[PDB]
Amino acid sequence: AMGEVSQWSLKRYGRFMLGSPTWKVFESSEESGSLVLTIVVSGHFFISQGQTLLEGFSLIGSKNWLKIVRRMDCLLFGTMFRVQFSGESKEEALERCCGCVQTLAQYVTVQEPD
Amino acid sequence: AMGEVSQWSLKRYGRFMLGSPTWKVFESSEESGSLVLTIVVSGHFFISQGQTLLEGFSLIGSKNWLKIVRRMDCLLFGTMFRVQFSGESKEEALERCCGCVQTLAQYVTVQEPD
């Protein structure tokens, strides 16, 4: 909303968990609540579903420990979690994703797949 | 949730608006959604109701332009908005308020009423 934050809505978020599941996958539901990726101008990164914070860390000095890769409208974050931007079409999601890459890339490099 | 943020729930938030209302008052409802005051470790301050950001600014260098006053379990913010912390009792609300004052006071001074 503000000029202090940028925000993008997500279709999905998945936490690498490593019985023993590999992923815990969160989706934007009417009940569950909507997924938002937030980047604050000081360089803080959050993912939130409604009001619970699923992810929260500084992007400052993340060159040292953080790896981001984009495949189309998804980002993978490693050192692990995975995010997919929403939209009514593949273009609209991709356009969301790219806008976010633009702010993310101010702090880290966003690589292409290996 | 994280170690990157502190969060407190609010009973009420009121925006000074100056037909011509003086205040717009937001409350924690089941429909409307719950009020959260968030302070991020880089010094960013937010109030949010569900996922809408009602307030968002930096506390860094706010000594120059920002005035905070505490009356019991409420804070008034001027240069204007007003916040009241929640709790099952007056003590619990006051205890919430004070915890927040403790992080706020790292950036600004929190005055007593005039």
JSON list of C-alpha atoms in Angstrom, two decimals:
[
{"chain": "A", "resi": 1, "resn": "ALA", "atom": "CA", "xyz": [0.00, 0.00, 0.00]},
{"chain": "A", "resi": 2, "resn": "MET", "atom": "CA", "xyz": [2.54, 2.63, 1.32]},
{"chain": "A", "resi": 3, "resn": "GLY", "atom": "CA", "xyz": [5.70, 4.13, -0.28]},
{"chain": "A", "resi": 4, "resn": "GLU", "atom": "CA", "xyz": [7.60, 2.27, 2.42]},
{"chain": "A", "resi": 5, "resn": "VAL", "atom": "CA", "xyz": [6.71, -1.19, 1.16]},
{"chain": "A", "resi": 6, "resn": "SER", "atom": "CA", "xyz": [6.11, -3.11, -2.04]},
{"chain": "A", "resi": 7, "resn": "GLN", "atom": "CA", "xyz": [3.66, -6.00, -1.98]},
{"chain": "A", "resi": 8, "resn": "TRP", "atom": "CA", "xyz": [2.70, -8.78, -4.43]},
{"chain": "A", "resi": 9, "resn": "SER", "atom": "CA", "xyz": [0.08, -11.45, -4.02]},
{"chain": "A", "resi": 10, "resn": "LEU", "atom": "CA", "xyz": [1.07, -15.12, -4.31]},
{"chain": "A", "resi": 11, "resn": "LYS", "atom": "CA", "xyz": [-0.87, -18.14, -5.59]},
{"chain": "A", "resi": 12, "resn": "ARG", "atom": "CA", "xyz": [1.29, -20.61, -3.63]},
{"chain": "A", "resi": 13, "resn": "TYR", "atom": "CA", "xyz": [4.13, -20.81, -1.15]},
{"chain": "A", "resi": 14, "resn": "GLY", "atom": "CA", "xyz": [6.02, -23.99, -0.26]},
{"chain": "A", "resi": 15, "resn": "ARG", "atom": "CA", "xyz": [8.40, -24.53, 2.68]},
{"chain": "A", "resi": 16, "resn": "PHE", "atom": "CA", "xyz": [11.14, -27.15, 2.29]},
{"chain": "A", "resi": 17, "resn": "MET", "atom": "CA", "xyz": [10.64, -29.18, 5.49]},
{"chain": "A", "resi": 18, "resn": "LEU", "atom": "CA", "xyz": [13.90, -31.16, 5.37]},
{"chain": "A", "resi": 19, "resn": "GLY", "atom": "CA", "xyz": [5.98, -38.75, 9.04]},
{"chain": "A", "resi": 20, "resn": "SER", "atom": "CA", "xyz": [8.64, -36.70, 7.21]},
{"chain": "A", "resi": 21, "resn": "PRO", "atom": "CA", "xyz": [7.04, -34.45, 4.51]},
{"chain": "A", "resi": 22, "resn": "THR", "atom": "CA", "xyz": [9.37, -32.70, 2.06]},
{"chain": "A", "resi": 23, "resn": "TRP", "atom": "CA", "xyz": [7.12, -29.66, 1.47]},
{"chain": "A", "resi": 24, "resn": "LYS", "atom": "CA", "xyz": [4.40, -27.83, 3.30]},
{"chain": "A", "resi": 25, "resn": "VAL", "atom": "CA", "xyz": [2.38, -25.98, 0.68]},
{"chain": "A", "resi": 26, "resn": "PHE", "atom": "CA", "xyz": [0.26, -22.91, 1.41]},
{"chain": "A", "resi": 27, "resn": "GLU", "atom": "CA", "xyz": [-2.35, -21.53, -0.98]},
{"chain": "A", "resi": 28, "resn": "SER", "atom": "CA", "xyz": [-4.49, -18.39, -1.16]},
{"chain": "A", "resi": 29, "resn": "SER", "atom": "CA", "xyz": [-7.90, -19.53, 0.13]},
{"chain": "A", "resi": 30, "resn": "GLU", "atom": "CA", "xyz": [-11.03, -17.65, 1.24]},
{"chain": "A", "resi": 31, "resn": "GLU", "atom": "CA", "xyz": [-10.84, -19.52, 4.62]},
{"chain": "A", "resi": 32, "resn": "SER", "atom": "CA", "xyz": [-7.03, -20.02, 4.86]},
{"chain": "A", "resi": 33, "resn": "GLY", "atom": "CA", "xyz": [-6.40, -16.36, 3.79]},
{"chain": "A", "resi": 34, "resn": "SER", "atom": "CA", "xyz": [-4.33, -14.74, 1.01]},
{"chain": "A", "resi": 35, "resn": "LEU", "atom": "CA", "xyz": [-0.57, -14.97, 0.48]},
{"chain": "A", "resi": 36, "resn": "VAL", "atom": "CA", "xyz": [1.38, -11.76, 0.29]},
{"chain": "A", "resi": 37, "resn": "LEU", "atom": "CA", "xyz": [5.11, -11.25, -0.33]},
{"chain": "A", "resi": 38, "resn": "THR", "atom": "CA", "xyz": [6.25, -7.98, 1.19]},
{"chain": "A", "resi": 39, "resn": "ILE", "atom": "CA", "xyz": [9.50, -6.13, 0.72]},
{"chain": "A", "resi": 40, "resn": "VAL", "atom": "CA", "xyz": [10.13, -3.20, 3.01]},
{"chain": "A", "resi": 41, "resn": "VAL", "atom": "CA", "xyz": [12.40, -0.37, 1.81]},
{"chain": "A", "resi": 42, "resn": "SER", "atom": "CA", "xyz": [15.04, -1.09, 4.57]},
{"chain": "A", "resi": 43, "resn": "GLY", "atom": "CA", "xyz": [15.40, -4.51, 2.77]},
{"chain": "A", "resi": 44, "resn": "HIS", "atom": "CA", "xyz": [13.21, -6.80, 4.92]},
{"chain": "A", "resi": 45, "resn": "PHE", "atom": "CA", "xyz": [11.42, -9.63, 3.18]},
{"chain": "A", "resi": 46, "resn": "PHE", "atom": "CA", "xyz": [8.24, -11.26, 4.41]},
{"chain": "A", "resi": 47, "resn": "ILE", "atom": "CA", "xyz": [5.69, -13.75, 3.23]},
{"chain": "A", "resi": 48, "resn": "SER", "atom": "CA", "xyz": [2.45, -13.69, 5.12]},
{"chain": "A", "resi": 49, "resn": "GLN", "atom": "CA", "xyz": [-0.86, -15.57, 5.00]},
{"chain": "A", "resi": 50, "resn": "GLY", "atom": "CA", "xyz": [-3.44, -13.30, 6.55]},
{"chain": "A", "resi": 51, "resn": "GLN", "atom": "CA", "xyz": [-1.58, -12.18, 9.65]},
{"chain": "A", "resi": 52, "resn": "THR", "atom": "CA", "xyz": [0.76, -15.16, 10.28]},
{"chain": "A", "resi": 53, "resn": "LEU", "atom": "CA", "xyz": [4.32, -14.54, 9.08]},
{"chain": "A", "resi": 54, "resn": "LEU", "atom": "CA", "xyz": [5.57, -17.56, 7.18]},
{"chain": "A", "resi": 55, "resn": "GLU", "atom": "CA", "xyz": [8.92, -16.02, 6.25]},
{"chain": "A", "resi": 56, "resn": "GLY", "atom": "CA", "xyz": [10.93, -13.05, 7.54]},
{"chain": "A", "resi": 57, "resn": "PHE", "atom": "CA", "xyz": [14.55, -12.07, 7.01]},
{"chain": "A", "resi": 58, "resn": "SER", "atom": "CA", "xyz": [16.87, -9.28, 5.88]},
{"chain": "A", "resi": 59, "resn": "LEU", "atom": "CA", "xyz": [17.98, -9.04, 2.25]},
{"chain": "A", "resi": 60, "resn": "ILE", "atom": "CA", "xyz": [20.95, -6.82, 3.29]},
{"chain": "A", "resi": 61, "resn": "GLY", "atom": "CA", "xyz": [24.16, -8.88, 3.01]},
{"chain": "A", "resi": 62, "resn": "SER", "atom": "CA", "xyz": [22.17, -11.84, 1.62]},
{"chain": "A", "resi": 63, "resn": "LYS", "atom": "CA", "xyz": [24.67, -12.12, -1.30]},
{"chain": "A", "resi": 64, "resn": "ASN", "atom": "CA", "xyz": [26.74, -14.20, 1.13]},
{"chain": "A", "resi": 65, "resn": "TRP", "atom": "CA", "xyz": [24.11, -16.82, 2.13]},
{"chain": "A", "resi": 66, "resn": "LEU", "atom": "CA", "xyz": [21.02, -16.49, -0.17]},
{"chain": "A", "resi": 67, "resn": "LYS", "atom": "CA", "xyz": [20.41, -17.84, -3.68]},
{"chain": "A", "resi": 68, "resn": "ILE", "atom": "CA", "xyz": [17.31, -16.94, -5.72]},
{"chain": "A", "resi": 69, "resn": "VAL", "atom": "CA", "xyz": [16.28, -18.60, -9.00]},
{"chain": "A", "resi": 70, "resn": "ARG", "atom": "CA", "xyz": [13.33, -17.63, -11.25]},
{"chain": "A", "resi": 71, "resn": "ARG", "atom": "CA", "xyz": [11.48, -20.16, -13.44]},
{"chain": "A", "resi": 72, "resn": "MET", "atom": "CA", "xyz": [8.72, -18.26, -15.30]},
{"chain": "A", "resi": 73, "resn": "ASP", "atom": "CA", "xyz": [6.28, -16.99, -12.60]},
{"chain": "A", "resi": 74, "resn": "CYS", "atom": "CA", "xyz": [8.00, -18.82, -9.67]},
{"chain": "A", "resi": 75, "resn": "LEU", "atom": "CA", "xyz": [10.96, -18.01, -7.41]},
{"chain": "A", "resi": 76, "resn": "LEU", "atom": "CA", "xyz": [13.01, -20.61, -5.53]},
{"chain": "A", "resi": 77, "resn": "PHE", "atom": "CA", "xyz": [14.91, -19.34, -2.48]},
{"chain": "A", "resi": 78, "resn": "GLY", "atom": "CA", "xyz": [17.91, -21.34, -1.18]},
{"chain": "A", "resi": 79, "resn": "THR", "atom": "CA", "xyz": [20.98, -20.97, 1.10]},
{"chain": "A", "resi": 80, "resn": "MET", "atom": "CA", "xyz": [14.76, -23.36, 1.05]},
{"chain": "A", "resi": 81, "resn": "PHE", "atom": "CA", "xyz": [11.29, -22.17, 0.01]},
{"chain": "A", "resi": 82, "resn": "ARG", "atom": "CA", "xyz": [9.39, -21.60, -3.21]},
{"chain": "A", "resi": 83, "resn": "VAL", "atom": "CA", "xyz": [6.79, -19.03, -4.25]},
{"chain": "A", "resi": 84, "resn": "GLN", "atom": "CA", "xyz": [4.42, -18.60, -7.16]},
{"chain": "A", "resi": 85, "resn": "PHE", "atom": "CA", "xyz": [2.88, -15.22, -8.00]},
{"chain": "A", "resi": 86, "resn": "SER", "atom": "CA", "xyz": [-0.85, -14.98, -8.80]},
{"chain": "A", "resi": 87, "resn": "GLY", "atom": "CA", "xyz": [-2.74, -13.54, -11.79]},
{"chain": "A", "resi": 88, "resn": "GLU", "atom": "CA", "xyz": [-5.80, -14.14, -14.00]},
{"chain": "A", "resi": 89, "resn": "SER", "atom": "CA", "xyz": [-3.40, -15.13, -16.85]},
{"chain": "A", "resi": 90, "resn": "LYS", "atom": "CA", "xyz": [0.17, -16.51, -17.18]},
{"chain": "A", "resi": 91, "resn": "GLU", "atom": "CA", "xyz": [1.21, -12.99, -18.38]},
{"chain": "A", "resi": 92, "resn": "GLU", "atom": "CA", "xyz": [-0.27, -11.21, -15.38]},
{"chain": "A", "resi": 93, "resn": "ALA", "atom": "CA", "xyz": [1.49, -13.63, -12.99]},
{"chain": "A", "resi": 94, "resn": "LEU", "atom": "CA", "xyz": [4.75, -13.27, -14.93]},
{"chain": "A", "resi": 95, "resn": "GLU", "atom": "CA", "xyz": [4.37, -9.44, -14.82]},
{"chain": "A", "resi": 96, "resn": "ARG", "atom": "CA", "xyz": [3.87, -9.62, -11.05]},
{"chain": "A", "resi": 97, "resn": "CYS", "atom": "CA", "xyz": [6.90, -11.92, -10.67]},
{"chain": "A", "resi": 98, "resn": "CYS", "atom": "CA", "xyz": [9.10, -9.60, -12.74]},
{"chain": "A", "resi": 99, "resn": "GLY", "atom": "CA", "xyz": [8.17, -6.47, -10.73]},
{"chain": "A", "resi": 100, "resn": "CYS", "atom": "CA", "xyz": [9.20, -8.31, -7.61]},
{"chain": "A", "resi": 101, "resn": "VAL", "atom": "CA", "xyz": [12.43, -9.54, -9.21]},
{"chain": "A", "resi": 102, "resn": "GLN", "atom": "CA", "xyz": [13.17, -5.83, -9.88]},
{"chain": "A", "resi": 103, "resn": "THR", "atom": "CA", "xyz": [13.06, -4.92, -6.18]},
{"chain": "A", "resi": 104, "resn": "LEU", "atom": "CA", "xyz": [14.71, -8.23, -5.07]},
{"chain": "A", "resi": 105, "resn": "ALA", "atom": "CA", "xyz": [17.54, -7.70, -7.55]},
{"chain": "A", "resi": 106, "resn": "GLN", "atom": "CA", "xyz": [18.46, -4.43, -5.74]},
{"chain": "A", "resi": 107, "resn": "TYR", "atom": "CA", "xyz": [19.82, -6.64, -2.88]},
{"chain": "A", "resi": 108, "resn": "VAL", "atom": "CA", "xyz": [20.70, -10.02, -4.48]},
{"chain": "A", "resi": 109, "resn": "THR", "atom": "CA", "xyz": [21.16, -11.46, -7.90]},
{"chain": "A", "resi": 110, "resn": "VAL", "atom": "CA", "xyz": [18.24, -13.45, -9.29]},
{"chain": "A", "resi": 111, "resn": "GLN", "atom": "CA", "xyz": [19.67, -16.32, -11.35]},
{"chain": "A", "resi": 112, "resn": "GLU", "atom": "CA", "xyz": [18.21, -18.32, -14.24]},
{"chain": "A", "resi": 113, "resn": "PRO", "atom": "CA", "xyz": [17.76, -22.12, -13.80]},
{"chain": "A", "resi": 114, "resn": "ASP", "atom": "CA", "xyz": [20.86, -24.38, -13.77]},
{"chain": "B", "resi": 1, "resn": "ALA", "atom": "CA", "xyz": [6.22, -14.18, 14.81]},
{"chain": "B", "resi": 2, "resn": "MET", "atom": "CA", "xyz": [9.91, -13.94, 13.63]},
{"chain": "B", "resi": 3, "resn": "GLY", "atom": "CA", "xyz": [13.05, -12.54, 15.36]},
{"chain": "B", "resi": 4, "resn": "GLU", "atom": "CA", "xyz": [12.96, -9.84, 12.70]},
{"chain": "B", "resi": 5, "resn": "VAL", "atom": "CA", "xyz": [9.71, -8.29, 13.87]},
{"chain": "B", "resi": 6, "resn": "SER", "atom": "CA", "xyz": [7.76, -7.55, 17.01]},
{"chain": "B", "resi": 7, "resn": "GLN", "atom": "CA", "xyz": [3.96, -7.53, 16.82]},
{"chain": "B", "resi": 8, "resn": "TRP", "atom": "CA", "xyz": [1.15, -6.49, 19.19]},
{"chain": "B", "resi": 9, "resn": "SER", "atom": "CA", "xyz": [-2.57, -6.74, 18.64]},
{"chain": "B", "resi": 10, "resn": "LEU", "atom": "CA", "xyz": [-4.72, -3.61, 18.91]},
{"chain": "B", "resi": 11, "resn": "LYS", "atom": "CA", "xyz": [-8.32, -3.14, 20.07]},
{"chain": "B", "resi": 12, "resn": "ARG", "atom": "CA", "xyz": [-8.73, 0.14, 18.15]},
{"chain": "B", "resi": 13, "resn": "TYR", "atom": "CA", "xyz": [-6.95, 2.46, 15.77]},
{"chain": "B", "resi": 14, "resn": "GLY", "atom": "CA", "xyz": [-8.11, 5.98, 14.90]},
{"chain": "B", "resi": 15, "resn": "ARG", "atom": "CA", "xyz": [-6.87, 8.18, 12.04]},
{"chain": "B", "resi": 16, "resn": "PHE", "atom": "CA", "xyz": [-7.10, 11.96, 12.48]},
{"chain": "B", "resi": 17, "resn": "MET", "atom": "CA", "xyz": [-8.85, 12.96, 9.23]},
{"chain": "B", "resi": 18, "resn": "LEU", "atom": "CA", "xyz": [-8.24, 16.72, 9.43]},
{"chain": "B", "resi": 19, "resn": "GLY", "atom": "CA", "xyz": [-19.03, 15.69, 5.36]},
{"chain": "B", "resi": 20, "resn": "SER", "atom": "CA", "xyz": [-15.80, 16.35, 7.32]},
{"chain": "B", "resi": 21, "resn": "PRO", "atom": "CA", "xyz": [-15.23, 13.63, 10.00]},
{"chain": "B", "resi": 22, "resn": "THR", "atom": "CA", "xyz": [-12.47, 14.22, 12.56]},
{"chain": "B", "resi": 23, "resn": "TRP", "atom": "CA", "xyz": [-11.65, 10.53, 13.11]},
{"chain": "B", "resi": 24, "resn": "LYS", "atom": "CA", "xyz": [-11.96, 7.30, 11.22]},
{"chain": "B", "resi": 25, "resn": "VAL", "atom": "CA", "xyz": [-11.96, 4.52, 13.80]},
{"chain": "B", "resi": 26, "resn": "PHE", "atom": "CA", "xyz": [-10.97, 0.93, 13.04]},
{"chain": "B", "resi": 27, "resn": "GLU", "atom": "CA", "xyz": [-11.70, -1.99, 15.36]},
{"chain": "B", "resi": 28, "resn": "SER", "atom": "CA", "xyz": [-10.71, -5.66, 15.51]},
{"chain": "B", "resi": 29, "resn": "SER", "atom": "CA", "xyz": [-13.75, -7.49, 14.09]},
{"chain": "B", "resi": 30, "resn": "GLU", "atom": "CA", "xyz": [-14.31, -11.07, 12.90]},
{"chain": "B", "resi": 31, "resn": "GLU", "atom": "CA", "xyz": [-15.48, -9.66, 9.50]},
{"chain": "B", "resi": 32, "resn": "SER", "atom": "CA", "xyz": [-13.38, -6.44, 9.38]},
{"chain": "B", "resi": 33, "resn": "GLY", "atom": "CA", "xyz": [-10.23, -8.36, 10.54]},
{"chain": "B", "resi": 34, "resn": "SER", "atom": "CA", "xyz": [-7.76, -7.88, 13.41]},
{"chain": "B", "resi": 35, "resn": "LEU", "atom": "CA", "xyz": [-5.51, -4.88, 14.07]},
{"chain": "B", "resi": 36, "resn": "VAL", "atom": "CA", "xyz": [-1.81, -5.48, 14.38]},
{"chain": "B", "resi": 37, "resn": "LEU", "atom": "CA", "xyz": [0.98, -3.00, 15.14]},
{"chain": "B", "resi": 38, "resn": "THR", "atom": "CA", "xyz": [4.25, -4.22, 13.71]},
{"chain": "B", "resi": 39, "resn": "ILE", "atom": "CA", "xyz": [7.75, -2.97, 14.32]},
{"chain": "B", "resi": 40, "resn": "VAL", "atom": "CA", "xyz": [10.48, -4.36, 12.11]},
{"chain": "B", "resi": 41, "resn": "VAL", "atom": "CA", "xyz": [14.05, -4.49, 13.44]},
{"chain": "B", "resi": 42, "resn": "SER", "atom": "CA", "xyz": [15.32, -1.97, 10.75]},
{"chain": "B", "resi": 43, "resn": "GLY", "atom": "CA", "xyz": [12.89, 0.49, 12.51]},
{"chain": "B", "resi": 44, "resn": "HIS", "atom": "CA", "xyz": [9.80, 0.36, 10.25]},
{"chain": "B", "resi": 45, "resn": "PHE", "atom": "CA", "xyz": [6.42, 0.81, 11.88]},
{"chain": "B", "resi": 46, "resn": "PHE", "atom": "CA", "xyz": [3.16, -0.53, 10.51]},
{"chain": "B", "resi": 47, "resn": "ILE", "atom": "CA", "xyz": [-0.42, -0.87, 11.56]},
{"chain": "B", "resi": 48, "resn": "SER", "atom": "CA", "xyz": [-2.41, -3.34, 9.56]},
{"chain": "B", "resi": 49, "resn": "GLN", "atom": "CA", "xyz": [-5.99, -4.63, 9.54]},
{"chain": "B", "resi": 50, "resn": "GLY", "atom": "CA", "xyz": [-5.89, -8.05, 7.93]},
{"chain": "B", "resi": 51, "resn": "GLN", "atom": "CA", "xyz": [-3.72, -7.31, 4.92]},
{"chain": "B", "resi": 52, "resn": "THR", "atom": "CA", "xyz": [-4.45, -3.59, 4.32]},
{"chain": "B", "resi": 53, "resn": "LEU", "atom": "CA", "xyz": [-1.70, -1.30, 5.66]},
{"chain": "B", "resi": 54, "resn": "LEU", "atom": "CA", "xyz": [-3.26, 1.58, 7.55]},
{"chain": "B", "resi": 55, "resn": "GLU", "atom": "CA", "xyz": [0.05, 3.11, 8.62]},
{"chain": "B", "resi": 56, "resn": "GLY", "atom": "CA", "xyz": [3.66, 2.73, 7.45]},
{"chain": "B", "resi": 57, "resn": "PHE", "atom": "CA", "xyz": [6.74, 4.83, 8.12]},
{"chain": "B", "resi": 58, "resn": "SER", "atom": "CA", "xyz": [10.33, 4.76, 9.38]},
{"chain": "B", "resi": 59, "resn": "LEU", "atom": "CA", "xyz": [11.10, 5.39, 13.05]},
{"chain": "B", "resi": 60, "resn": "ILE", "atom": "CA", "xyz": [14.75, 6.22, 12.15]},
{"chain": "B", "resi": 61, "resn": "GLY", "atom": "CA", "xyz": [15.26, 10.00, 12.51]},
{"chain": "B", "resi": 62, "resn": "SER", "atom": "CA", "xyz": [11.67, 10.38, 13.78]},
{"chain": "B", "resi": 63, "resn": "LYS", "atom": "CA", "xyz": [12.98, 12.42, 16.79]},
{"chain": "B", "resi": 64, "resn": "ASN", "atom": "CA", "xyz": [12.83, 15.38, 14.40]},
{"chain": "B", "resi": 65, "resn": "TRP", "atom": "CA", "xyz": [9.16, 15.10, 13.26]},
{"chain": "B", "resi": 66, "resn": "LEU", "atom": "CA", "xyz": [7.33, 12.51, 15.46]},
{"chain": "B", "resi": 67, "resn": "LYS", "atom": "CA", "xyz": [5.78, 12.86, 18.91]},
{"chain": "B", "resi": 68, "resn": "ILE", "atom": "CA", "xyz": [4.38, 9.88, 20.86]},
{"chain": "B", "resi": 69, "resn": "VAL", "atom": "CA", "xyz": [2.33, 10.13, 24.08]},
{"chain": "B", "resi": 70, "resn": "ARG", "atom": "CA", "xyz": [1.08, 7.23, 26.24]},
{"chain": "B", "resi": 71, "resn": "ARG", "atom": "CA", "xyz": [-2.12, 7.43, 28.32]},
{"chain": "B", "resi": 72, "resn": "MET", "atom": "CA", "xyz": [-2.53, 4.06, 30.11]},
{"chain": "B", "resi": 73, "resn": "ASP", "atom": "CA", "xyz": [-3.06, 1.43, 27.35]},
{"chain": "B", "resi": 74, "resn": "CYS", "atom": "CA", "xyz": [-3.22, 3.97, 24.45]},
{"chain": "B", "resi": 75, "resn": "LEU", "atom": "CA", "xyz": [-0.61, 5.73, 22.31]},
{"chain": "B", "resi": 76, "resn": "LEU", "atom": "CA", "xyz": [-1.19, 9.01, 20.46]},
{"chain": "B", "resi": 77, "resn": "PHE", "atom": "CA", "xyz": [1.12, 9.67, 17.50]},
{"chain": "B", "resi": 78, "resn": "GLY", "atom": "CA", "xyz": [1.58, 13.28, 16.27]},
{"chain": "B", "resi": 79, "resn": "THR", "atom": "CA", "xyz": [3.94, 15.40, 14.11]},
{"chain": "B", "resi": 80, "resn": "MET", "atom": "CA", "xyz": [-1.91, 12.23, 13.90]},
{"chain": "B", "resi": 81, "resn": "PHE", "atom": "CA", "xyz": [-3.29, 8.81, 14.84]},
{"chain": "B", "resi": 82, "resn": "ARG", "atom": "CA", "xyz": [-4.21, 6.93, 18.00]},
{"chain": "B", "resi": 83, "resn": "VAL", "atom": "CA", "xyz": [-3.98, 3.28, 18.99]},
{"chain": "B", "resi": 84, "resn": "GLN", "atom": "CA", "xyz": [-5.29, 1.15, 21.83]},
{"chain": "B", "resi": 85, "resn": "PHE", "atom": "CA", "xyz": [-3.76, -2.24, 22.66]},
{"chain": "B", "resi": 86, "resn": "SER", "atom": "CA", "xyz": [-6.03, -5.24, 23.34]},
{"chain": "B", "resi": 87, "resn": "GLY", "atom": "CA", "xyz": [-6.26, -7.66, 26.28]},
{"chain": "B", "resi": 88, "resn": "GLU", "atom": "CA", "xyz": [-8.78, -9.62, 28.37]},
{"chain": "B", "resi": 89, "resn": "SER", "atom": "CA", "xyz": [-8.07, -7.20, 31.29]},
{"chain": "B", "resi": 90, "resn": "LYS", "atom": "CA", "xyz": [-6.82, -3.59, 31.72]},
{"chain": "B", "resi": 91, "resn": "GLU", "atom": "CA", "xyz": [-3.51, -5.12, 33.01]},
{"chain": "B", "resi": 92, "resn": "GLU", "atom": "CA", "xyz": [-3.02, -7.35, 29.99]},
{"chain": "B", "resi": 93, "resn": "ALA", "atom": "CA", "xyz": [-3.63, -4.40, 27.63]},
{"chain": "B", "resi": 94, "resn": "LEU", "atom": "CA", "xyz": [-1.31, -2.20, 29.69]},
{"chain": "B", "resi": 95, "resn": "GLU", "atom": "CA", "xyz": [1.36, -4.96, 29.63]},
{"chain": "B", "resi": 96, "resn": "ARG", "atom": "CA", "xyz": [1.04, -5.17, 25.83]},
{"chain": "B", "resi": 97, "resn": "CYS", "atom": "CA", "xyz": [1.27, -1.37, 25.52]},
{"chain": "B", "resi": 98, "resn": "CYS", "atom": "CA", "xyz": [4.38, -1.23, 27.71]},
{"chain": "B", "resi": 99, "resn": "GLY", "atom": "CA", "xyz": [6.23, -3.94, 25.72]},
{"chain": "B", "resi": 100, "resn": "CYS", "atom": "CA", "xyz": [5.61, -1.91, 22.60]},
{"chain": "B", "resi": 101, "resn": "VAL", "atom": "CA", "xyz": [6.72, 1.31, 24.29]},
{"chain": "B", "resi": 102, "resn": "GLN", "atom": "CA", "xyz": [9.99, -0.54, 25.05]},
{"chain": "B", "resi": 103, "resn": "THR", "atom": "CA", "xyz": [10.74, -1.16, 21.37]},
{"chain": "B", "resi": 104, "resn": "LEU", "atom": "CA", "xyz": [9.34, 2.27, 20.26]},
{"chain": "B", "resi": 105, "resn": "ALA", "atom": "CA", "xyz": [11.49, 4.03, 22.85]},
{"chain": "B", "resi": 106, "resn": "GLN", "atom": "CA", "xyz": [14.64, 2.63, 21.13]},
{"chain": "B", "resi": 107, "resn": "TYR", "atom": "CA", "xyz": [13.94, 5.15, 18.28]},
{"chain": "B", "resi": 108, "resn": "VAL", "atom": "CA", "xyz": [11.88, 7.99, 19.85]},
{"chain": "B", "resi": 109, "resn": "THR", "atom": "CA", "xyz": [10.97, 9.22, 23.26]},
{"chain": "B", "resi": 110, "resn": "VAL", "atom": "CA", "xyz": [7.51, 8.27, 24.52]},
{"chain": "B", "resi": 111, "resn": "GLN", "atom": "CA", "xyz": [6.18, 11.19, 26.58]},
{"chain": "B", "resi": 112, "resn": "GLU", "atom": "CA", "xyz": [3.62, 11.33, 29.38]},
{"chain": "B", "resi": 113, "resn": "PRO", "atom": "CA", "xyz": [0.46, 13.46, 28.86]},
{"chain": "B", "resi": 114, "resn": "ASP", "atom": "CA", "xyz": [0.75, 17.29, 28.91]}
]
